Amino acid sequence: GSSGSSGVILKEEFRGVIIKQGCLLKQGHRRKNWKVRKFILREDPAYLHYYDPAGAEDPLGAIHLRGCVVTSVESNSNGRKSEEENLFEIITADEVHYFLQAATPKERTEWIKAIQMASRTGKSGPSSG
């Protein structure tokens, strides 16, 4: 759901289009349970913004993809319950690591490719690599 007709000025970090949208579980350092968050990906520019599902207005933050990296995790996942299933690490330009969680086993992959597609950018930008 991304559409607007004569609303408000157009930011810069959002001077692009959406490729994929959904809720993801962003981990933390403290490692105290996960927290559902609406992770929105936008290519050109290549950035990942995540807002609050409860409501909120602005994005809690953003993840630079100017030269981020995508990778899969181990995620044992075996037995029952499955504390955490379908995860993946996404390294940024700062080397920052983030472990997200996809609902379906297809989303986990899609997301990756999703981020990759954006991160892939089309060259010509702020430094880039």
UniProtKB/Swiss-Prot annotation:
First and last residue of the signal peptide: none
Domain called PH: residue spans: 17-120
Transmembrane segments annotated in the record for this chain: none
Top-level taxon of the source organism: Eukaryota
Function: Major protein kinase C substrate of platelets.
Protein name: Pleckstrin
Organism listed in the record: Homo sapiens (Human)
Residues shown, of full length: 235 to 350 of 350
